[model samples]
Target: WGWKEVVQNGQTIFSAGQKLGNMVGKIVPLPFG
Candidate 1:
């Protein structure tokens, strides 16, 4: 991936979104995003 891809993904997974989504089992099947 290029720098832009890296930056965008980092911002999504580690910035605005929850860091727990990166964990093994921190996410669940819910209607909340």
Candidate 2:
């Protein structure tokens, strides 16, 4: 969700999207949080 575009499928993202998603989810606390 940062500089990288998320290419995801449902609950899991393909690659960096999922990893970055977790990190951002931890810090920012969005819906994915």
RMSD of each: 9.2, 13.2
Return the TM-score for each candidate structure. Answer: 0.32, 0.27
Local accuracy of candidate 1 as per-residue lDDT tens digits, 1-33: 599888987788667445554576465786885
Candidate 2 structure quality by residue, lDDT tens digits, 1-33: 543433334335446577877877775446965
The lDDT for every candidate, in the order shown, is 0.68, 0.57
Please give the RMSD of candidate 1 to the true structure: 9.2
lDDT of 2: 0.57
Score residue 32 of candidate 2 by CA lDDT.
65
Give lDDT for model 1.
0.68
lDDT of 1 at 12: 82
